[PDB]
């Protein structure tokens, strides 16, 4: 099976229908306050009506805030869109960071569309290029045969298809996408070592139009419009060949796109589905980023945002003198929820250790479990988790299967924690 | 009926289909030809 | 339920201006209440905008955070209505690597202004069922002379029986916009367009500047085209072939502007074709951007001198109750008035934002309770599970050691 | 001056420069959009003349290599997973492939049996994928067509394999499906029954 | 041959027995036996390849083989497994954001192996006839077992006539591709005419049946797939390295498609290994970004090296152990290296002398070992070849301790250089 990461055990928030947090469920423990709060938030987004609300998490480092976001995603299913990122990626060498944030917000939302589409394929019978415009193409298929006018654009496409007759093609009127499928299977015997392959005549009508539940983000709508790879005019082609550099997108484009999407919704064909945006290490953002967040969260179309930080009241990035709680400016802090996190005790450590051991499926002595819980009490939890694989390797190499205290101590003197290094540095 | 489909081939039903991309309609902008009537002193 | 792109907004409630016809305040209407002095000042400024006889006047709105100056600005914007240009942009959008700095502010200004123009065009059609000249018609038929592109194009055109697009009789262009008068089942009009100088300049800049509009790519258009187009606009104004409708502009968080920005603003305001401008900022005495100078709101003294100010004041208790009830009905949530009172208290101690936040959480909690009316118990539980600024600051201060750098 | 040794492979295990390209390239954009077209009332004929002159200039200049340029920057719009899917679709085709390879090693003409009409088309896909011969037997064909097909089979030994319509000479066939009516080769029935699909062929009674 | 005797050429592995006990000498290595144990465990776990995202750091005195340990690891790993070593200063670039650079390195480290069946024939060019008018063609081939005769395809005709193959040659053609390849001429093929033409060797006639099917396997890295499909003719940029801001939607699309290809036996992934040197050269931004860069499943194990102690965090004023924020520190484990002992130094220098192929006196060994111990090992390593050159200038073979003293006097060392700079402080400006 695919590899297993640290945050793989997580599968669900572990709440109960009543709205409470079961002590042991879906790979979670303790922090009933946080678990029920996440329940409230997931219900809020399930409302699918509120827009612009935002929340933040905090607490001791390595308490699973990332795990909480992941579990929210787990219980959210797949239909709703989702997007992670970090403060570091905001800095770019292509466009301003404001535009990076706005692009993120645009792609947080999702869209779903039911689309017509009209196709044309068959076996090429003839190709009469009467007067360019009058390019009639005769197509043969098991159902029968037809011949229809053509667009000189598709004429050039066919030219470039290297197709004459007795071969299979595939034409879509909307995109005008032109394509070949090798040669017909009728000519499977003329020669013996002719290179090109063969496929049989289509078993359906030349014409067919089928609907499809397509889904796209508003970000992709904007970007697809911005740089018109579509079209075929030579001026457009030349515009395409130029280097693909991403550019800041004018907001008038945004407004027109919003209007057109409103029209599409009024057609009843398309239905909207907002997403949730998760941002990690928000403290890494500068003062300008928070300044623009102030306005960005105001929009009537902004999806729900989440944050994360593991820092005290320290200096503010891009500010270098003011200190604010968690480093986030107090003004922006005024605009957000707050959800905290506790610390743990040895028993919870034993519980989570059992969970992880099952996750990677390793037999272990209960004494080793006790000693490892003691170590975690002394050290950080992440340090305790990291010891599992070396212990397993020690067990396997020596031929035994379950882990014992001897292997635990062996790993102990093999590797040391940060504080151990510091005291010996 | 539904025994033989799976017993022989699942593609016999729900035939695998090749995806594609959306062909958005073109974008238009109203204006007046007067934008160019002048600016050509000559 | 069915939703448009927009949804419940943080400041959706407002729809206009709670102003009397005599530019006087009515205590509560249009989704806003209180702050009567700012209300009258904003009415005066909006009247200035309507008149538009003066050129490029500037105003600033101060006040401690929380006082919804953005609310006032959005109320102004609604009051203007969808007939005059209005531009709103925060302070950080100004820094863009694509173009230089002064260029970005100059483009902003030239975008804010607006030029209107109406035009006419005669277009008539005949009900031609056959798609092939023989301009089949039911009102009055024409066999007028035949072109070439029209002949080779309309013949192969795909159209339903009796359908009649509003084709250009005056020209013949295939304009597939109109419908059939009666076959399937004329007005020169005054086509009115709105345009800004940022549109005219980019359109004339190159062969396809309209592409650059959407692409947001063009940078540093030479000032020569700018001045020439200004001359062209003026000489169209004089001849009556065109008219101007001076728009407006809004900026936010001007405290986050460089000193060079303020100097360029001081120059540019002096110009003639400057749309009216509005500002926004909260802090009091603060350091200016780029140096150690402490200045009122961190704005250069000279720029302040050539600018006016209007202040706001906190909300009293009953003001808070009024705002709470209006936003509670806005969200369509119904409370027990004891809940109203306890929540109003809490909001007074903590903040306005905290209450505007708690309302929806309480609504959802009650939905889980399956009731329709929320009481104090639910609010207390919600406030227990989530924290405000002060409570979180404290809780850190107990765990200060855990959190790094503290 | 002109070393131009060669465009070395990018560590593609020997062959390279096309197989990696056509094996990896699959991306499709979610959306494709046309260029925006400005809407103006009657425009000046002078701008029209200048832009049309530009439209003339662009070609001829591009004409000689306009074609070569046009093959490129035409982003793929869709794909078609091959019968490699058959891997995860039906164990029948994958499991028989080995014995069909054995038969091709031997060299007997092989007629194949089945009942579903569409399974014939799928098996035709299979045949094409393995690069073997074929001949289709259906029921829409008339009797003279049936006998002409038999004549094609017998007169021509070039073909190697054939498919029979369940309705109604060589020495290689194997059953495929089940039915109720009566109408040295080894017949390895297409029974992928590791479950009740065995009893499914055993009794065939009212119960 | 392009290689040359390098400082770390003497390394050939790690010298660990099956139970991972290091051997006091093996494939050019000895010392830091605890470090050798830990490294053996790491290599074993890499072979297991059942887990992702693990990270480890190596700290110790400078010039104590940390790079040597890493290179022995890389050697023992083998070429099949992808590997990549980079320097901290290298990410800082004027073409891309740092985060994009880190993503590029990560994706480079991981590799993918593609398997696919083949279908080909090969044999002598027994005879060919082409019949230009289209062109009619007839041809035959054979092998060491039998012979056959076939028609000729029109596109086959163009292919071969461009190939201009000579009858009697040995070649192989794939039906689907229809691309031919010459695999070496044969006795009759290169028997040629009376006319000179050319001269060439021969190859043995092929064997087995013409048709052979056969399976081919390939390998490529994730970043390579990203780049090749990114710009649609961004392929040539692979060498130019001009790729910029490879978008995220592309990343996720590739991840989805590769996963689905994976679980269907189409191909097999392989968890590569990535090593970064002078990790302290990273700022706080890179620490933040990579801190989460380990959760993504496609996470090759990371190895870091740095000798600092309680140093200012790059880009700020915060002292931290080795200048790495504690958030990362708790996410990884450490290994320490001790300064070497006396006799082990003798062994190391003898190994390096063997490397250089210069064999000299025992008193020279004693004196040089003591001098290097007092000053540093690296200065001794420098003096090795210098003494070799001096002795060869003497025209003898055995280097003598007097020659060692001569060369030592010739090339002042660090301590002597600072002592000199002291001898005249005002010699050089800005003191
Ligand atoms: N209920 C839980 N069960 C198991 N592990 C947990 C739980 N809560 C937190 N963790 C641990 O927290 C770690 C993730 O920490 P992380 O979220 O990155 O730190 P922070 O919470 O400061 O962002 C994981 O290794 C996970 O094992
Ligand atoms: N009555 C209100 N209605 C809406 N928003 C308010 C109200 N009072 C305070 N605020 C909000 O408090 C935030 C910080 O206050 P302040 O900056 O003074 O307001 P503004 O953003 O309007 O300048 C503002 O974003 C504003 O939206
Ligand atoms: N125990 C050893 N065995 C063999 N060679 C060694 C040993 N220790 C050091 N060396 C040699 O000395 C060098 C030590 O440099 P190193 O400490 O790795 O540099 P850095 O401090 O940059 O990591 C290595 O390149 C290696 O060639």
Query: What is the DSSP annotation of D52-109?
Result: HHHHHHHHHHSHHHHHHHHHSS---------GGGHHHH-HHHHHHHHHHHHHHHHT--
Closest by CA position to C27, among listed C44, C35, C42, C344: C35
Name the residue with tokens 């959190």: C403
Ligand 3 atom nearest residue E307's Cα: 21
For residue E268, what are the β-bridge partners? E113
Name the closest-CA residue to atom 4, ligand 3.
E29
Taking contacts as CB-CB distances below 8 angstroms, the residues of chain C near A337 are 357, 386
- Give the phi and the psi of residue C19 in degrees, each rounded to 5: -115, 140
Instruction: Please give the Cα distance from C342 to D192 (Å, whole number).
Output: 71
Taking contacts as CB-CB distances below 8 angstroms, the residues of chain D near A177 are 77-78
Closest by CA position to E351, among listed E5, E25, E14: E25
Q: Which of C210, C236, C242 sits opposite B29 (nearest CB)?
A: C210
First CA to last CA distance, chain D = 88
Q: Is A116 annotated as a binding residue?
A: no
Contact C256, A292 (CB under 8 A): no
Closest by CA position to C60, among listed C287, C230, C304: C304
Instruction: Please give the Cα distance from D205 to C87 (Å, whole number).
Output: 82
Q: In chain A, what are the domain boundaries?
A: 1-107+225-343, 108-224, 344-425
- Give the phi and the psi of residue E122 in degrees, each rounded to 5: -160, 145
Both tokens of A270, joined, read 């398309």
Contact E335, E38 (CB under 8 A): yes
Name the residue with tokens 């986030």: A328
| A and D in touch (3+ CB pairs within 8 angstroms) | yes
Nearest chain A residue to E20, by CA: A397
Burial of A328 (0-12, 13-18, 19+ CB in 10 A): buried
Give chain C's domains with CATH numbers.
9-113+196-315 (3.40.50.300), 316-406 (1.10.8.60)
Contact A307, A281 (CB under 8 A): no
Instruction: Please give the Cα distance from C179 to D39 (Å, whole number).
Output: 19
For residue C115, what are the β-bridge partners? C195, C244
Closest by CA position to C109, among listed C265, C303, C289, C280: C265
Give the distance from residue D38's alpha carbon to the nearest chain B alpha carbon, in angstroms.
5
HSE (CB half, 13 Å, CA atoms) of A339?
Answer: 25
Instruction: Please give the Cα distance from C315 to C324 (Å, whole number).
Output: 12
Both tokens of D131, joined, read 């690069």
Instruction: Please give the Cα distance from E419 to C196 (Å, whole number).
Output: 75
**R_g over Cα of chain A:** 30
CA distances to A240, D157, D187 from D171, rounded to whole Å, are 61, 13, 11
Both tokens of A321, joined, read 């003198």
Q: Quick one: CA dihedral A70, A73, A77, A81, positive or negative?
A: negative
Name the closest-CA residue to atom 26, ligand 2.
C68
Taking contacts as CB-CB distances below 8 angstroms, the residues of chain C near B31 are 193, 195, 203
Residues E88-116: b if buried by 16+ CB within 10 A, e if exposed = beebeeeebbbbbbbbbbbbbbbbbebee
E229 CA to centre of ligand 2 in angstroms: 48
Closest by CA position to A292, among listed E359, C92, E428, C275: C92
Run of H or E including E284? helix E284-293
C-beta of A28 in contact with ligand 1 (< 6 A): yes
Instruction: Please give the Cα distance from B35 to D41 (Å, whole number).
Output: 11
**Taking CB atoms and an 8 Å limit, are A61 and E48 in contact across chains?**
no
Resolution (A): 5.3
Q: How many CB atoms lie within 10 A of CB D35?
A: 22
Instruction: Quote the longest CA-to-CA distance of chain B.
Output: 83
Nearest chain D residue to B9, by CA: D90
Instruction: Please give the Cα distance from D34 to C385 (Å, whole number).
Output: 51
Chains in contact with B, counting 3 or more C-beta pairs less than 8 Å apart as contact = A, C, D
Closest by CA position to D173, among listed D89, D91, D105, D96: D96
Instruction: Please give the Cα distance from C347 to C357 (Å, whole number).
Output: 10
Q: Are strands E136-142 and E301-305 parallel, antiparallel or unpaired?
A: unpaired
Q: Which of D33, D67, D124 sits opposite A228 (nearest CB)?
A: D33
Taking contacts as CB-CB distances below 8 angstroms, the residues of chain C near A225 are 214
Mutate to test the pocket of ligand 2, among A290, A293, A299, A335 (most ligand atoms within 8 A of CB): A335
Q: Which of C90, C351, C368 sits opposite A294 (nearest CB)?
A: C90
- Which conformational region is residue A52 in: left (phi greater than 0), alpha (psi within -120 to 50 degrees), or beta? left
Give the distance from residue D191's alpha carbon to the nearest chain E alpha carbon, in angstroms.
23
Instruction: Please give the Cα distance from D28 to B5 (Å, whole number).
Output: 32
Contact D98, B35 (CB under 8 A): no
Burial of A349 (0-12, 13-18, 19+ CB in 10 A): buried
B26 interfaces chain C, CB cutoff of 8 Å: no
Using the 8-state DSSP alphabet, how is residue D72 labeled?
S
Q: How many CB atoms lie within 10 A of CB A365?
A: 15
Instruction: Quote the longest CA-to-CA distance of chain D.
Output: 88
C-beta of A64 in contact with ligand 1 (< 6 A): yes
What residues does ligand 2 touch, defined as CB less than 6 Å away? C 11, 63, 65-71, 280, 282, 323, 352
Interface of D with C in 42-101 (CB under 8 A): 42, 51, 54
For residue E276, what are the β-bridge partners? E86, E304
Mutate to test the pocket of ligand 1, among A31, A63, A355 (most ligand atoms within 8 A of CB): A63
Both tokens of E28, joined, read 């050019």
Using the 8-state DSSP alphabet, how is residue A88 labeled?
G
Asked if domains A108-224 and A344-425 share a fold, the reply is: no
Instruction: Please give the Cα distance from E279 to C241 (Å, whole number).
Output: 69
Give the full edge-to-edge strand order of the sheet including C191-195: C191-195, C115-119, C243-244
Name the closest-CA residue to atom 17, ligand 1.
A64
Q: Are strands C191-195 and E311-312 parallel, antiparallel or unpaired?
A: unpaired
Q: Which of B30, B36, B38 sits opposite C193 (nearest CB)?
A: B30
**CATH class of the A344-425 domain in this structure:** mainly alpha
E308 CA to centre of ligand 3 in angstroms: 17
Chains in contact with E, counting 3 or more C-beta pairs less than 8 Å apart as contact = A, C, D
Residue C347: nearest ligand to its CA?
Answer: 2
Q: How many CB atoms lie within 10 A of CB A226?
A: 21
Q: In sequence order, which residues have a C-beta less than 8 Å from that of residue D144 and are 6 or more positions away?
A: none
| Torsion of Cα atoms, A228 then A230 then A236 then A240, to 10° | 70
Outline where DSSP puts E strands in E250-296: 267-270, 273-277
Helices (H), A184-336: 218-226, 234-241, 251-266, 287-296, 330-333
Closest by CA position to A303, among listed C5, E341, C98: C5
Name the residue with tokens 């060589």: D170
Nearest chain C residue to A37, by CA: C385
> Method of determination?
cryo-EM
Both tokens of A348, joined, read 């919870």
Q: Are strands A213-216 and A110-114 parallel, antiparallel or unpaired?
A: antiparallel
One DSSP character per residue, E133-164 reads ---EEEEEEE-SS-EEEEE--HHHHHHHHHHT
Helix axes A32-47, C376-385, angle to 10 degrees: 110
Binding residues of E for ATP: 60-67
Q: Are strands C276-278 and C58-61 parallel, antiparallel or unpaired?
A: parallel
One DSSP character per residue, E45-57 reads HHHH--B---EEE
CA distances to C36, C37, C344, E346 from C317, rounded to whole Å, are 16, 19, 8, 87
One DSSP character per residue, E224-265 reads HHHHHHHTTS-TTHHHHT------HHHHHHHHHHHHHHHTTT
Run of H or E including A125? strand A119-129
Mutate to test the pocket of ligand 3, among E16, E28, E67, E369 (most ligand atoms within 8 A of CB): E67
Residues C187-219: b if buried by 16+ CB within 10 A, e if exposed = eeeeeebbbbbbbbbbbbbeebbbbbbbbbbbe
Residue E9: nearest ligand to its CA?
Answer: 3
For residue A277, what are the β-bridge partners? A83, A305
Closest by CA position to E285, among listed E104, E101, E106: E101
Instruction: Please give the Cα distance from E121 to E119 (Å, whole number).
Output: 7
Instruction: Please give the Cα distance from D160 to D109 (Å, whole number).
Output: 5
Contact A220, A108 (CB under 8 A): no
Mutate to test the pocket of ligand 2, among C31, C35, C71 (most ligand atoms within 8 A of CB): C71
Instruction: Please give the Cα distance from A58 to A309 (Å, whole number).
Output: 6
Which of A113, A181, A237 to probe by mutation at the D interface, max D CB count within 10 Å? Answer: A237
| Torsion of Cα atoms, A251 then A254 then A256 then A258, to 10° | -140
Closest by CA position to A68, among listed A21, A129, A120, A16: A21
Ligand 2 atom nearest residue C72's Cα: 22
**R_g over Cα of chain E:** 30
One DSSP character per residue, A372-425 reads HHHHHHHS-HHHHHHTHHHHHHHHHHTT--SB-HHHHHHHHHHS--HHHHHHH-
Both tokens of A378, joined, read 């002394």
**Taking CB atoms and an 8 Å limit, are A234 and D35 in contact across chains?**
no
Instruction: Please give the Cα distance from C218 to A248 (Å, whole number).
Output: 10
Instruction: Please give the Cα distance from C115 to C109 (Å, whole number).
Output: 13
The vertex-E209 CA angle with E203 and E215, nearest 5°, equals 90
The SS3 of residue E366 is helix
C65 CA to centre of ligand 2 in angstroms: 6
Instruction: Please give the Cα distance from E214 to A414 (Å, whole number).
Output: 48
Both tokens of A222, joined, read 């904007």
CA distances to C17, C20, C72 from C36, rounded to whole Å, are 11, 11, 11
Taking contacts as CB-CB distances below 8 angstroms, the residues of chain C near A59 are 399, 402
Contact E107, E222 (CB under 8 A): yes
The SS3 of residue E147 is strand
Ligand 3 atom nearest residue E377's Cα: 12
Q: Are strands E301-305 and E273-277 parallel, antiparallel or unpaired?
A: parallel
Give the distance from residue A422's alpha carbon to the nearest chain C alpha carbon, in angstroms.
17
What fold, for A108-224? OB fold (Dihydrolipoamide Acetyltransferase, E2P) (2.40.50)
Q: In sequence order, which residues have a C-beta less than 8 Å from that of residue C250 and are 6 or more positions away?
A: C73, C77, C86, C87, C88, C89, C277, C278, C280
Using the 8-state DSSP alphabet, how is residue A173 labeled?
T
First CA to last CA distance, chain E = 45
| Torsion of Cα atoms, D138 then D143 then D144 then D150, to 10° | 60
In CATH, A1-107+225-343 is 2.60.40.10:
no
Both tokens of A418, joined, read 């940060």
Taking contacts as CB-CB distances below 8 angstroms, the residues of chain A near D67 are 160
Instruction: Please give the Cα distance from A198 to A184 (Å, whole number).
Output: 5
D35 interfaces chain B, CB cutoff of 8 Å: yes
Q: Is A59 annotated as a binding residue?
A: yes
Instruction: Please give the Cα distance from C276 to E126 (Å, whole number).
Output: 91
CA distances to C203, C229, C246, E411 from C116, rounded to whole Å, are 16, 15, 9, 84
Q: In sequence order, which residues have a C-beta less than 8 Å from that of residue C284 and are 6 or more positions away?
A: C296, C297
Instruction: Please give the Cα distance from D74 to D71 (Å, whole number).
Output: 7
* Contacts of the segment A266-273: beta carbons below 8 A, 24+ positions apart: A269/A113, A269/A114, A270/A111, A270/A112, A270/A113, A270/A114, A271/A112, A272/A109, A272/A110, A272/A111, A272/A112, A272/C3, A272/C5, A273/A48, A273/A79, A273/A80, A273/A81, A273/A109, A273/A110, A273/A111, A273/A112
Name the residue with tokens 């530019």: C23
Q: How many CB atoms lie within 10 A of CB E28?
A: 21
E19 interfaces chain C, CB cutoff of 8 Å: no
Q: Quick one: CA dihedral A401, A405, A406, A411, positive or negative?
A: positive
The SS3 of residue E173 is strand
Closest by CA position to A34, among listed A59, A7, A6: A59
The SS3 of residue E369 is helix
Contact A184, A201 (CB under 8 A): yes
């Amino acid at each position: 099976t695919q590899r297993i990461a640290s945050h793989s055990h997580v599968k669900g928030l572990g709440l109960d229908e009543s709205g409470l947090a079961k002590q042991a469920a879906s790979g979670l423990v303790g922090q009933e306050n946080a678990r029920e709060a996440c329940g409230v938030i997931v219900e809020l987004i399930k409302s699918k009506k509120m827009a612009g609300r935002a929340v933040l998490l905090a607490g001791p480092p390595g308490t699973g805030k990332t795990a909480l976001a992941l579990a929210i995603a787990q219980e959210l299913g797949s239909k709703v869109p989702f997007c992670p990122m970090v403060g570091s990626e905001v800095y770019s060498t292509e466009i301003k960071k404001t535009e990076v944030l706005m692009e993120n917000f645009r792609r947080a939302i999702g869209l779903r569309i039911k689309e017509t589409k009209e196709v044309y394929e068959g076996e090429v019978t003839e190709l009469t290029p009467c007067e360019i415009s009058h390019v009639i193409i005769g197509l043969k298929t098991a159902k029968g045969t037809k011949q229809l006018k053509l667009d000189p654009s598709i004429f050039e496409s066919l030219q470039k298809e290297r197709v004459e007759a007795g071969d299979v093609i595939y034409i879509e009127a909307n995109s005008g996408a032109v394509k070949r499928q090798g040669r017909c299977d009728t000519y499977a015997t003329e020669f013996d070592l002719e290179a090109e392959e063969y496929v049989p005549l289509p078993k359906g009508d030349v014409h067919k139009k089928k609907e499809i539940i397509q889904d796209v983000t508003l970000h992709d709508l904007d970007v697809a419009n911005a740089r018109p790879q579509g079209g075929q005019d030579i001026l457009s082609m030349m515009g395409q060949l130029m280097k693909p550099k991403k550019t800041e997108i004018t907001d008038k484009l945004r407004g027109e796109i919003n209007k057109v999407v409103n029209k599409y919704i009024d057609q009843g064909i398309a239905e909207l589905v907002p997403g949730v945006l998760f941002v990690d290490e928000v403290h890494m953002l500068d003062i300008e980023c928070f300044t623009y967040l102030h306005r960005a969260l105001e929009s009537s179309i902004a999806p729900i945002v989440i944050f994360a930080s593991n820092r005290g009241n320290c200096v503010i990035r891009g500010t270098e003198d003011i200190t604010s709680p968690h480093g986030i400016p107090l003004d922006l802090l005024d605009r957000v929820m707050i959800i905290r996190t506790m610390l743990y005790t040895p028993q919870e450590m034993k519980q989570i250790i059992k969970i992880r051991a099952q996750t990677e499926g390793i037999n272990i002595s209960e004494e080793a479990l006790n000693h490892l819980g003691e170590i975690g009490t002394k050290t950080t939890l992440r340090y305790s988790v990291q010891l599992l694989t070396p212990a397993n390797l020690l067990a396997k190499i020596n031929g035994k299967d379950s882990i014992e205290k001897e292997h635990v101590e062996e790993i102990s003197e093999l590797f040391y924690d940060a504080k151990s290094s510091a005291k010996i540095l | 009926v539904r025994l033989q489909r799976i017993c022989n081939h699942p593609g016999l039903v729900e035939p695998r289909h090749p995806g594609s991309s959306y062909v958005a309609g073109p974008l238009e902008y109203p204006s007046a030809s007067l934008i160019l009537k002048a600016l050509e002193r000559d | 339920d069915v939703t448009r792109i927009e949804r419940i907004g943080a400041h959706s409630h407002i729809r206009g201006l709670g102003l009397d016809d005599a530019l006087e305040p009515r205590q509560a209407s249009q989704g806003m209440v209180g702050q009567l002095a700012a209300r009258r000042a904003a009415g005066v400024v909006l009247e200035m905008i309507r008149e538009g006889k003066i050129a490029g006047r500037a105003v600033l709105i101060a006040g401690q955070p929380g006082t919804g100056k953005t609310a006032i600005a959005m109320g102004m914007a609604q009051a203007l209505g969808p007939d005059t240009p209005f531009t709103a942009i925060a302070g950080s959008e100004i820094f863009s690597l694509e173009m230089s700095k002064t260029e970005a502010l100059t483009q902003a200004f030239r975008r804010s202004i607006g030029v209107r123009i109406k035009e006419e065009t005669e277009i008539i059609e005949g009900e031609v069922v056959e798609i092939q000249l023989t301009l089949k018609t039911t009102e009055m038929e024409t066999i007028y002379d035949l072109g070439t592109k029209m002949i080779e194009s309309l013949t192969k055109d795909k159209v339903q029986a009796g359908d009649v697009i509003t084709i250009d009789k005056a020209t013949g262009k295939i304009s597939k916009l109109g419908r059939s008068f009666t076959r399937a089942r004329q007005k020169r009009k005054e086509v009115v367009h709105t345009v800004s100088l940022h549109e005219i300049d980019v359109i004339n800049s190159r062969t396809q500047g309209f592409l650059a509009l959407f692409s947001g790519d063009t940078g540093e258009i030479k000032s020569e085209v700018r001045e020439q187009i200004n001359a062209k606009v003026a000489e169209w104004r004089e001849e009556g072939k065109a008219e101007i409708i001076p728009g407006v502009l809004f900026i936010d968080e001007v405290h986050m502007l460089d000193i060079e920005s303020f100097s360029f603003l001081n120059r540019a305001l002096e110009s003639d074709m400057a749309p009216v401008l509005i500002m926004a900022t909260n802090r009091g005495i603060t350091r200016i951007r780029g140096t150690s100078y402490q200045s009122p709101h961190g704005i250069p003294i000279d720029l302040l001198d050539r600018l006016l100010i209007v202040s706001t004041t906190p909300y009293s208790e009953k003001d808070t109750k009024q705002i709470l009830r209006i936003r509670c009905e806005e969200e369509d949530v119904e409370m027990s008035e004891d809940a109203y009172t306890v929540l109003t208290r809490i909001g007074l101690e903590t903040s306005l934002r905290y209450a505007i936040q708690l309302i929806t959480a309480a609504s959802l909690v009650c939905r889980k309770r399956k009731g329709t009316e929320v009481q104090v118990d639910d609010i207390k539980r919600v406030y227990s599970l989530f924290l405000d600024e002060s409570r979180s600051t404290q809780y850190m201060k107990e765990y200060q050691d855990a959190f790094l750098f503290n | 001056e002109s070393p131009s040794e060669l465009m070395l492979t990018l560590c593609r295990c020997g062959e390279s420069l096309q197989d990696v390209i056509d094996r990896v390239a699959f991306v499709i954009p979610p959306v494709v959009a046309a260029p925006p077209s400005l809407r103006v009332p009657r425009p000046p004929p002078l701008y029209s003349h200048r832009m049309r002159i530009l439209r003339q200039g662009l070609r001829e200049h591009a004409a000689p290599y306009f074609q070569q340029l046009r093959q490129t920057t035409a982003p793929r719009l869709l794909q078609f997973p091959e019968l490699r899917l058959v891997q995860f679709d039906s164990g029948k085709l994958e499991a028989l492939a080995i014995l069909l390879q054995k038969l091709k090693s031997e060299g007997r003409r092989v007629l194949i049996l089945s009942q579903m009409i569409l399974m014939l088309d799928i098996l035709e896909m299979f045949l094409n994928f393995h690069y073997l011969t074929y001949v289709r037997i259906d029921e829409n064909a008339s009797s003279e067509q049936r006998q002409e097909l038999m004549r094609s089979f017998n007169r021509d030994r070039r073909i190697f394999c054939a498919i029979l319509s369940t309705h109604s000479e060589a020495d290689t066939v194997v059953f495929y499906d089940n039915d109720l009516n009566p109408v040295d080769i080894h017949i390895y029935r297409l029974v992928s029954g590791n479950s009740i699909e065995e009893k499914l062929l055993k009794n065939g009674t009212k119960d």
